[PDB]
Structures are given as C-alpha cells and as structure tokens.
Design an enzyme around this catalytic site. Structure first.
Site, mmCIF file in Angstrom:
data_model
loop_
_atom_site.group_PDB
_atom_site.id
_atom_site.type_symbol
_atom_site.label_atom_id
_atom_site.label_comp_id
_atom_site.label_asym_id
_atom_site.label_seq_id
_atom_site.Cartn_x
_atom_site.Cartn_y
_atom_site.Cartn_z
ATOM 1 N N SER A 101 5.033 -5.448 -1.503
ATOM 2 C CA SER A 101 5.246 -4.042 -1.838
ATOM 3 C C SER A 101 6.065 -3.339 -0.763
ATOM 4 O O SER A 101 7.211 -3.717 -0.507
ATOM 5 C CB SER A 101 3.911 -3.326 -2.041
ATOM 6 O OG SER A 101 4.076 -1.922 -1.982
ATOM 7 N N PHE B 95 -0.571 1.035 -14.926
ATOM 8 C CA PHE B 95 -1.181 1.362 -13.640
ATOM 9 C C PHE B 95 -0.311 2.190 -12.701
ATOM 10 O O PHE B 95 -0.772 2.569 -11.621
ATOM 11 C CB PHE B 95 -1.603 0.082 -12.911
ATOM 12 C CG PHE B 95 -2.391 -0.877 -13.757
ATOM 13 C CD1 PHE B 95 -3.616 -0.515 -14.281
ATOM 14 C CD2 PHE B 95 -1.913 -2.148 -14.009
ATOM 15 C CE1 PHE B 95 -4.342 -1.402 -15.051
ATOM 16 C CE2 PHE B 95 -2.632 -3.036 -14.778
ATOM 17 C CZ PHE B 95 -3.850 -2.663 -15.300
ATOM 18 N N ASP C 27 6.921 -3.862 -14.556
ATOM 19 C CA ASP C 27 6.862 -2.992 -13.391
ATOM 20 C C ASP C 27 7.650 -1.721 -13.672
ATOM 21 O O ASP C 27 8.709 -1.764 -14.303
ATOM 22 C CB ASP C 27 7.430 -3.698 -12.155
ATOM 23 C CG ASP C 27 6.974 -3.068 -10.852
ATOM 24 O OD1 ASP C 27 6.742 -1.842 -10.822
ATOM 25 O OD2 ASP C 27 6.854 -3.800 -9.849
ATOM 26 N N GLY D 260 0.796 -1.211 0.000
ATOM 27 C CA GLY D 260 0.000 0.000 0.000
ATOM 28 C C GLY D 260 0.832 1.265 0.000
ATOM 29 O O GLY D 260 0.311 2.357 0.244
ATOM 30 N N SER D 261 2.133 1.124 -0.257
ATOM 31 C CA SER D 261 3.056 2.254 -0.385
ATOM 32 C C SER D 261 3.124 3.092 0.886
ATOM 33 O O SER D 261 3.244 4.315 0.822
ATOM 34 C CB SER D 261 2.689 3.134 -1.581
ATOM 35 O OG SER D 261 2.669 2.386 -2.782
ATOM 36 N N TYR E 211 -5.901 -8.703 1.625
ATOM 37 C CA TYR E 211 -4.801 -9.309 2.363
ATOM 38 C C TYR E 211 -5.263 -10.420 3.294
ATOM 39 O O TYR E 211 -4.487 -11.339 3.586
ATOM 40 C CB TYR E 211 -4.053 -8.237 3.158
ATOM 41 C CG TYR E 211 -3.306 -7.267 2.273
ATOM 42 C CD1 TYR E 211 -2.412 -7.722 1.311
ATOM 43 C CD2 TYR E 211 -3.508 -5.898 2.382
ATOM 44 C CE1 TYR E 211 -1.733 -6.843 0.493
ATOM 45 C CE2 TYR E 211 -2.832 -5.011 1.566
ATOM 46 C CZ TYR E 211 -1.946 -5.490 0.625
ATOM 47 O OH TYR E 211 -1.272 -4.610 -0.187
ATOM 48 N N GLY F 259 0.287 -6.680 -8.598
ATOM 49 C CA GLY F 259 -0.963 -7.262 -8.155
ATOM 50 C C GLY F 259 -1.353 -8.563 -8.811
ATOM 51 O O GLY F 259 -2.541 -8.895 -8.837
HETATM 52 C C1 LIG Z 1 -0.957 4.010 -6.754
HETATM 53 C C2 LIG Z 1 -0.793 2.709 -6.893
HETATM 54 C C3 LIG Z 1 -0.615 1.695 -5.779
HETATM 55 C C4 LIG Z 1 -0.708 0.342 -6.502
HETATM 56 C C5 LIG Z 1 -0.028 0.660 -7.841
HETATM 57 C C6 LIG Z 1 -0.752 1.971 -8.232
HETATM 58 O O1 LIG Z 1 -0.070 2.731 -9.226
HETATM 59 C C7 LIG Z 1 -2.173 1.633 -8.707
HETATM 60 C C8 LIG Z 1 -2.641 0.267 -8.200
HETATM 61 C C9 LIG Z 1 -2.220 0.035 -6.754
HETATM 62 C C10 LIG Z 1 -2.428 -1.388 -6.148
HETATM 63 C C11 LIG Z 1 -3.847 -1.730 -5.760
HETATM 64 C C12 LIG Z 1 -4.028 -2.590 -4.771
HETATM 65 C C13 LIG Z 1 -2.898 -3.224 -4.017
HETATM 66 O O2 LIG Z 1 -2.924 -2.771 -2.682
HETATM 67 C C14 LIG Z 1 -1.554 -2.874 -4.659
HETATM 68 C C15 LIG Z 1 -0.395 -3.464 -3.839
HETATM 69 C C16 LIG Z 1 -1.470 -3.427 -6.070
HETATM 70 O O3 LIG Z 1 -1.048 -4.485 -6.448
HETATM 71 O O4 LIG Z 1 -1.927 -2.501 -6.946
HETATM 72 C C17 LIG Z 1 -1.459 -1.364 -4.943
HETATM 73 C C18 LIG Z 1 -0.192 -0.875 -5.675
HETATM 74 C C19 LIG Z 1 0.963 -0.504 -4.750
HETATM 75 O O5 LIG Z 1 0.726 -0.453 -3.559
HETATM 76 O O6 LIG Z 1 2.046 -0.299 -5.266
#
Ligand SMILES: C=C1C[C@]23C[C@@]1(O)CC[C@H]2[C@@]12C=C[C@H](O)[C@@](C)(C(=O)O1)[C@H]2[C@@H]3C(=O)O
Lengths: 137, 334, 111, 438
Positions: free
Chosen positions: B182, B229, B280, B106-107, B118, B311
């Site tokens: 992540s 994405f 990626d 979730g960054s 999760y 994802g």
């Molecule tokens: C702003 C974001 C955050 C993403 C990439 C994205 O560019 C758009 C999609 C997000 C995401 C969505 C749900 C998951 O928590 C995550 C880890 C993923 O795989 O894809 C989330 C993923 C991430 O946490 O890196």
C-alpha cells in the site's frame, strides 16, 4: 421625554425609554461627574442602541461601534468612568473589549510604556513574579 | 452485496471491521483520534524462541526519532538449543543471501511493524522466500505528515547496508530487496529512487497495491466507488492528511509522473514487480504507474489480477496469495 | 490615566483576556498583580476550553479552591497538556488527570 | 473454537459466529450511513470501549449505543558489551559448575572490563558482579528509596492511576465503600481516588480505608501517621472517612476475621495490591493462602500490578540470563533522563533488586517475578475472572506519559483485557483487574 443636565449645565433632552438604558438614571439630576462631551457620547450610544432595539443590522451596529470606539486614551478613560457610574452594561463591555484588545501586546515593557504605568517592583519581588509565571515566558 | 461474492467471509469480516473502525477514527476537521486508534490496534511482541523456523528480535536503530525495526531470521539448523543474545547478530552462512526491507501499509496513518497482520506477513515471507526480513516502524500522519516516512526509510536502509553479519560470501556485499505494501509501496518507490541517487545498489523492488493518485477522476474511481471497502472520500481524506499544506494531489509524492516530478530516463532503477488488484478503486493509477515504468526505459513485470480486492495477501485462503508468493520467491531467488 | 485604575476597573478590563495575556499582565505592577490572582478570572480561563465537563460549578469551585486553586490547576498541568494540542478542547479525562495530580500534590505538600 | 486464520491476526471470533458478525457489520454500516457525523463523534468521544479482540461484544456495544516467550530489544553498543556479557555468562556458569576457582578470576575479570566500558552496561555489570562476588562467598533510607522511585520512574504513577480507574468504575451505584491496601506504603494512590468520589455524580459515599504494612518500630505508627494526613484531606473535600492500620510480617499472616468487615451489601469492598505478590512466592504455600482470603472477603474488584518477566526459574543461569536482559532494558530507559539525586537513588533501589535476585536463595530471595501468563494461571485456579480495562484508563496513561516523560519512548498497549507499560516494544509491567467468577 427627560432632561439630563451635565457639568456644562446644558439640559440635554432625550426620550424616557432611551434614557432608561442607564440603571442609575432609571433608579433616580445634577450629574456633577459626567462631562458634557461624555454625556453626549453616552446619549448617542443609547440612541443608536434604542434604534437597533426598536445579522445584517447586527453587523452594521457592530461596525458602527467599531467606528465610535476610535477615540484617544483620555476619551476611553472617561467612557469607562461614565459607563461604570451610569450602570450601562453594553458601553462598559465594549470599552472593556477595546482595552483588552489594546493590552494584548508584547513583553511588560510595552504594556508599561503604552499606558505610562510606572512599576516599582522591588527586585526580589520583580524576579519572583517573573519566575512564578515562567510558563508564559 | 457486491463485495460478498468476491472474497471469503473471513476476509470480508476483517476488511469491513477495519473500514468501520477507521470511519469512527476520522474527524472532518482534519484531526485523528490517535488514542482510540492505538487502543483498538492488535499487536504482538518479538520472540527469540524459534516458532515454525522463524524467530524475531527488535533493534533500536535511532533514539533521537525513536526509529525501530524488527528483524526476522530463519532458525539456526546447525545448532539445537535456542539462540542466545550474542547468537542474534551471527553471520549468515551461504554463497548468496538476500535481505528484504519491508514497508507496511495503512495509508500513512494506521498500523505498525508490531501489528499482528504485518508480523504474520513477514514471518511468511521468511518461510517461503528463505531470506531475512527487516520491518521498519516509520512515523505516521497527520502528526508527522511529510517527509518523515521517506527519511525513516533512508535511515533504515543505511543501517541495513552496514551490518557486517548480513554480508554474502560470494562478493562481500549485502543484497537488498525493497518491498512495500500500500503506502509501503509508495515509500519503497521513493526510497529506491533515493538509493539509486546514492551509492547503495538495490537489486529489486516489490510493490503490492502501491498508493498513488491524482487530481483527475479515472474511470475506476467513478465506476468503483464504495463497492469494495474503499471510497473516494476517505482516499481524499488520507491524501489531505499526508500531503503538505496548500498542495494538490499532483504533488510528486502523490503522482510520480506529474509534470513537477522527476524523469526516469537515464536513471538507474531496480527491476520492479508490481502487483495490481483488479477490483481496486485506484486500479487505473497503478496500471498507469506500470505503463510509465515500461515507457521510461525501465524493467517491470506487471501482475494484473482481475478479481483481486485489497488485502488479499493478509490470509492464505485464496489462489491470488499463492500465485503472488510464488512470483515473489522466483523474483527474489534469481 | 490608566496608571491609577482601581481594582474593579482592572478586573473588568481583565475579564476579556486569555491565560497568556493575564499571566503576562500580572507582571505589570503591584495592583495589577493583586487583581490578577483573582480566582474568578482563572476559573473562567480554566473552564473556557473545557466546554464539556459537568457536575455543578459550586462543587468544582469548592473542591479546586480547597486543593490549591485554579491558578495552580492551570500552570502545573493544564498548560503542558495544551502545549502540543492548542486547538484541542479538553473533555472529561483531562479534568480527571489534572485534579488527581492536584490532589497528589496537596497531600505531598501537606507535610 | 475460534477462526485460526483470524486468531493469528489477533481477533477472537467463533467459527459459527461469522454470519452474525457480518450481519452486525452490515447493520452498523447502515446506521453510520444514516446517523452520520454527529453519531460518529458520539461513538468516538462519548464511548468507552472494552476488549477490542472480541468482535461480537464490540459490535454489540456499538449497535446498542448508536440506537515461553523471550522479548529482546538490542540498543546500540560496542563489542566490549559482548565481552562483558561473555565474561558475565562465564562466571555464572563457572559458579554453577561448582568451580569456585575460576569464578574468583572471572569476577575479577568482569571488574577490569567494566571500567573501560561506558554507558548503561557499566552500571549493570557493576551491580551483577557484586551480587556474583558475594554469592561466591556464601557457598564458601528505605522510605526515601521508594520515594525517589516516584518522581523519576513512571511505573508507580502508571500503577496508581490505572488501578484507580478500575476501582472508580466498580464503585458507581454504592453508598458505602471500603478499600484494603496490601501495599499501603505511604498512601500515594488514595488522595487521587478520594477527589474523584467527591466530584462523582449522585453524591460521594462514605469512604473507609484500611492499610497493611511491613513490621518496624516506626512503621506501626507510620501507618497511623499516614491516616492522620488522609483524614485531613477527606474533610477539606467533605468526605466521610475512617481508618485502621495494620502490622504484619507477611500477607500470609492475615485472616478475614481481623479485618472487621461489615456485610458486603452494606459496604462495598475493593482489594488493592501493587508490587507485593511477588514477595510472597519465596514462602511455600503463601500465595494459595492469601488468594483464599481475598475470596473470603468477597470484594467487587481486585487490582494487581506486577512486573512482566520470568525471574523465578528453577535453574540459576536461566534466572541469570533473563534478569540480565530485563535489567538492561531498565537501565537503558534511564540513560537519557537528566542526572539528579532522584536518579542516583533510583539505581541503588534497583541495585538492591539485582543483588537479591541472584545472591540469595530460599525465603531470603523475594524477587520471584512472573509473567501475566503465569500470574493469570494462579488467579484463574483461585476463581478470579478477569475484569477488562477500557479506553478511558488507556487514555489517561497515555497522557500521563506526556506530562512528566516527554522524549522517552514509553508506550501503552492492551492485551487480554489488561494494560502494559513498556519501553518501545518491550513490556515491563502489567495492570490487571479481577472479579469473583459467577
Ligand atoms: C480505509 C481503508 C484502508 C484499507 C482500505 C479501506 O478503505 C478499508 C480497509 C483498509 C485495510 C485494512 C487493513 C490493512 O491494513 C489494509 C492495507 C487493507 O488491505 O485493507 C487497509 C487498506 C489500506 O490501507 O488501503
């Protein structure tokens, strides 16, 4: 072209449009209250603001105000008196912002000491006024 | 137009919805819309009734910081009736029992241990690897920027290592595997560093698309920018939100192999399983992390999937998920 | 001689401060205290960080003065909301919450 | 039929609507690429969002605007807690086995364990033993108590504010309104709603209030007393007011004829009920008669606030087990609250709740709690379609949990168009709004 005579009695001459910045003067000149020095200061302020009326110029005028406001306590008191008497919005607002910046100070000892304000709060009232504004403290 | 032919439609919908919602929730002056984010988040609750052989329950590990974790266990096959409250912290029967300590992605700003994406992953991990999982609920940025997550992980690990009912009958010890997704991979790497510094013996490490970055723009960032994405704009936003004030992306929490960082030579580290996605935006940083592990004198099994986006592990409808899960199971039961 | 300022001059000076400064100067002396309780100053303070509400200032001022005033609206609920988000500007829901709390307190203290 | 792989993840998307949702996501992406920061800020702060799970409706809104489960939480404790729970579960099974000889010793055994025990478990053990003690012998202030529950616990304030927003939203566009409070109590919900109608854009309506209360020599006039004070508030803010009190032993003793209802087009009706419908399940057939009267009223909204648990099982030790877990969470939430007379009287209020839960039977037991899944089954069969709650209600509840509660870990979550207040991850109460299905 109009002549205003102050407490000193000197007939300070100023242009009619420049003197029109004061609403009291515009409506109606012994001027028994405003002193010669304060009248000169108000004349200088009105002259500068008329020159401005007749941004880079905005900020130059602002720094000129900042330079002119650098005067002592009695001078600021008299400037407030004159601005209220002669109904000048800009000068009153500037001196008000100056004093507001001055009172942005410390605990009430500092405010009551810089202004020589003498408080006589009865200690019930002193304590109660302290508690009713406890969120600030 | 380019991301549609690389993922299934359901995965595309899920990731695109997440991206647009996070776009709405980000404000340019560095502030986050927390209330709307929590309103839009889909969550679940713990259930002590075994569903598909797994049951869960929450534990309040810490009260001063409100630190919480969810425990996933396999259903008691010996008994028939559903477990009671006392049966939850029942000692495990088995010569060897591995416990996975999981950190979610979730960054550093989104999602929670209660999230419906999760919880499903942790249940699937229990079902496939035949183990027990502890999912931590760490603090998030920009309200809790740094090092809040790295302290939540350490506290959760200290708690997990003390459970007398999680010990193994072979050697009277707990066998802990740190896993991260992540930003969870980032937390896992740093917590494994801290554990190696202290007396806790972590045996393995699993990273799924770990979050690392740097000042320079790698060729993947330039070539892959907004194609799948992810954009560099929001990456920089999240790095700015997480990191302290007045620091650049060369901070060791961002790039572990920066000159200001610490050297991994003469340092005890667990064996690593790093899964790197191909499509990626930050693939070069992850490959550089794997290479820096290889050249530092440590052990690592790199898993570079050519046509994998972010994802891919959230849905069991692709071959990458099955391959990664099989590799994780083989890595754990070794 | 600021120690003997009249009410209008004190009000003029105090139109250019914030909540902390006004509630600070309210403990300076008795005349400063009397001028500090003025409704206009506290209305200005309360509306200063709102910048988004609209129903007409007349209706809002009448309702808030009927239920206790703006000084209470600030002290009781607005300041705790502004404590953890000093930079954030209150929008629509903060007014709804604070005025509801004021109505509840007025009804409770009525008897 | 939904998409199973996504429905597991919390999203209700039709399998045949995937293409449409993807196309709308493309259109939305383009629009936010064009409109940019100002449009995104508008979408964030000037919009109320409903039911995030339904992706079709959420995306349509964005496009149109830019144009049995057992939840358990274990807190740190000691093995003496396990010994206490073992003793408590020993007496409940012994008293259920018709032993009535080991129960007396076991009840005495629980007492000796409680004194050594420290914390919130000592309070729960003391109150459950007392209800266990005089259950054995059964086979062989009030106004101030609910007041003390207001300034200490956040369940009453959450129930009032969250229900007010649903009523306020349904009253927009109407000139005459009428609300009926099944839980009138002392009218602490309505002062906050009256002020919101005063500052309503377009002009306040004519507000009419009708309360219903339990019988008592004083509560007949106490309801009259309450309307005396609300009439004084409705004039300080210039709102037309009307009032009428009621006295009734039970809500099943009501009918639509004696509520004195004008035509619904002339006056809009909104029914309210907070912590009242669970006291009606002891009486056979009670809940079906009351829900047939609400349909007769034909309101525009019906807000229900209840408790999220299953304390109405047909087996005693089943009810005993769930109630012990639920009231353990409640006493854990109050552990950190500073000690005060409001706090002391709050536990007595809950102690009377525990005691009625296991000691009484038949109509004497009124704490027949049910879960939202069970409650939603009753309302659905009546003909009450859900009315979803938005993010405006969610935001106020979150800030509500920040003025009075600071370090305590209360959280708000959305589920199926409802709002829940819980401690950490453990739900406690739920707020739902319903409307007649058309
Ligand atoms: C702003 C974001 C955050 C993403 C990439 C994205 O560019 C758009 C999609 C997000 C995401 C969505 C749900 C998951 O928590 C995550 C880890 C993923 O795989 O894809 C989330 C993923 C991430 O946490 O890196």
């Amino acid at each position: 072209k109009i002549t205003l005579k102050s407490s000193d009695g000197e007939n300070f001459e100023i242009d009619e449009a420049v003197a029109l910045e004061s609403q009291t003067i515009k409506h109606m000149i012994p001027l028994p209250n405003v002193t010669s020095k304060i009248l000169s200061k108000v004349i200088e302020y009105c002259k500068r603001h008329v020159e401005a009326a007749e941004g880079s110029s905005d900020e130059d005028l602002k720094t000129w105000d900042s330079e002119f406001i650098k005067v002592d306590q009695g001078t600021l008191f008299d400037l407030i008196l004159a601005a209220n008497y002669l109904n000048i919005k800009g000068l009153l607002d500037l001196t008000c912002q100056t004093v507001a910046d001055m009172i942005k100070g410390k605990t009430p000892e500092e405010i009551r000491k810089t202004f020589n304000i003498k408080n006589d709060f009865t200690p019930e009232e002193e304590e109660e006024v302290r508690r009713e504004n406890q969120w600030a403290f | 137009i380019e991301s549609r032919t690389v993922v299934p439609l359901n995965t595309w919908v899920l990731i695109s919805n997440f991206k647009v919602a996070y776009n709405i929730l980000r404000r340019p002056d560095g502030t986050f819309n927390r209330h709307l984010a929590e309103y839009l988040d889909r969550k679940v609750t713990a259930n002590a009734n075994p569903v598909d052989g797994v049951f869960s329950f929450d534990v309040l590990i810490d009260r001063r910081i409100n630190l919480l974790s969810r425990v996933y266990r396999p259903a008691y096959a010996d008994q028939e009736q559903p477990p009671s409250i006392l049966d939850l912290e029942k000692p495990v029967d088995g010569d060897i029992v591995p416990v996975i300590l999981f950190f979610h992605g979730g960054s550093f700003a989104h999602s929670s241990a209660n999230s419906a994406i999760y919880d499903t992953l942790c249940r699937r991990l229990v079902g496939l690897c035949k183990c027990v999982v502890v999912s931590v609920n760490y603090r998030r940025a920009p309200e809790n920027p740094y090092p809040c997550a790295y302290d939540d992980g350490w506290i959760a690990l200290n708690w997990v290592n003390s459970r007398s009912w999680l010990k193994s009958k072979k050697d009277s010890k707990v066998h802990i595997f740190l896993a991260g997704d992540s930003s969870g991979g980032n937390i896992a790497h740093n917590v494994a560093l801290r554990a190696g510094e202290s007396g806790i013996d972590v045996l393995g490490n699993i990273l799924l698309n770990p979050m690392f970055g740097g000042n320079e723009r790698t060729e993947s960032e330039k070539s892959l920018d907004g194609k799948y994405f992810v954009t560099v704009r929001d990456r920089d936003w999240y790095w700015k939100a997480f990191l302290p004030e007045g620091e650049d992306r060369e901070h060791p929490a961002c790039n572990p192999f920066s000159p200001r960082g610490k050297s991994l030579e003469g340092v005890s580290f667990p064996k690593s399983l790093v899964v790197v996605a191909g499509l990626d935006l930050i693939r070069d940083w992850q490959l550089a992390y794997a290479e820096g592990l290889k050249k530092a004198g440590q052990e690592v099994k790199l898993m570079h999937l050519e046509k994998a986006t972010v994802g891919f592990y959230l849905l069991p409808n692709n071959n990458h998920f099955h391959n990664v899960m099989d590799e994780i199971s083989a890595f754990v039961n070794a | 001689g600021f120690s003997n300022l009249d009410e209008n001059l004190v009000y003029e000076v105090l139109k250019h401060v914030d909540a902390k400064t006004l509630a600070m100067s309210s403990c300076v002396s008795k005349i400063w205290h009397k001028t500090a309780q003025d409704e206009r100053l506290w209305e200005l303070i309360c509306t200063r960080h709102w910048t988004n509400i609209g129903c007409g200032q007349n209706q809002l001022r009448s309702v808030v003065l009927a239920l206790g005033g703006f000084r209470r609206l600030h002290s009781l609920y607005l300041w705790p909301l502004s404590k953890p988000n000093p930079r954030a500007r209150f929008g629509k829901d903060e007014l709804k919450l604070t005025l509801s709390l004021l109505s509840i307190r007025y009804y409770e203290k009525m008897s | 039929m939904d998409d199973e792989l996504l429905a597991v993840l919390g999203y209700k998307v039709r399998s045949s609507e995937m293409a449409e949702v993807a196309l709308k996501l493309e259109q939305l992406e383009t629009m936010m690429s064009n409109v940019q920061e100002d449009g995104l800020s508008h979408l964030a702060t000037d919009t109320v969002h409903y039911n995030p799970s339904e992706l079709y409706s959420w995306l349509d809104n964005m496009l149109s605007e830019l144009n049995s489960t057992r939840s358990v939480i274990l807190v740190d404790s000691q093995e003496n807690g396990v010994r206490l729970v073992h003793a408590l579960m020993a007496c409940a099974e012994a008293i259920q086995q018709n032993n009535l000889t080991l129960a007396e010793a076991l009840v005495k055994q629980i007492g000796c364990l409680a004194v050594s025990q420290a914390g919130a478990m000592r309070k729960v053990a003391t109150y459950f033993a007392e209800a266990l003690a005089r259950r054995i012998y059964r086979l062989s202030l009030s106004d101030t108590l609910q007041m003390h529950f207001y300034e200490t616990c956040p369940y009453l304030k959450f129930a009032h504010f969250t229900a007010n927003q649903a009523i306020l939203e349904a009253f927009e566009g109407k000139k005459r309104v009428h609300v009926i409070d099944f839980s009138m109590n002392q009218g602490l919900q309505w002062p906050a709603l009256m002020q919101a109608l005063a500052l309503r854009e377009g002009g306040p309506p004519t507000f009419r209030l009708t309360g219903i209360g339990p019988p008592a020599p004083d509560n007949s006039d106490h309801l009259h007393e309450v309307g005396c004070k609300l009439a004084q508030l409705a004039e300080a803010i210039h709102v037309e007011f009307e009032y009428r009190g009621f006295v009734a032993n039970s809500l099943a003793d009501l009918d639509a004829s004696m509520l004195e209802l004008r035509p619904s087009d002339t006056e809009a009706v909104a029914v309210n009920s907070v912590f009242e419908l669970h006291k009606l399940l002891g009486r056979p057939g009670g809940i079906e008669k009351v829900l047939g009267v609400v349909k007769q009223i034909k309101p525009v909204i019906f807000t229900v606030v209840e408790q999220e648990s299953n304390h109405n099982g047909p087996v005693f030790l089943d009810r005993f087990t769930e109630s012990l877990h639920y009231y353990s969470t409640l006493f854990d939430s109050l552990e950190g609250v500073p000690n005060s007379q409001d706090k002391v009287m709050s536990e007595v209020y809950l102690g009377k709740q525990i005691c009625n839960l296991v000691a009484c039977e038949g109509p004497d037991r009124v704490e027949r709690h049910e879960t939202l899944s069970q409650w939603g089954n009753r309302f659905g069969s009546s003909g009450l379609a859900p009315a979803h709650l938005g993010s405006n209600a969610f935001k106020q509840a979150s800030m509500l949990l920040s003025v009075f509660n600071s370090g305590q870990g209360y959280r708000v979550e959305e589920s199926n168009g409802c709002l829940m207040l819980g401690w950490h991850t453990r739900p406690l109460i739920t707020t739902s709004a319903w409307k007649l299905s058309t």
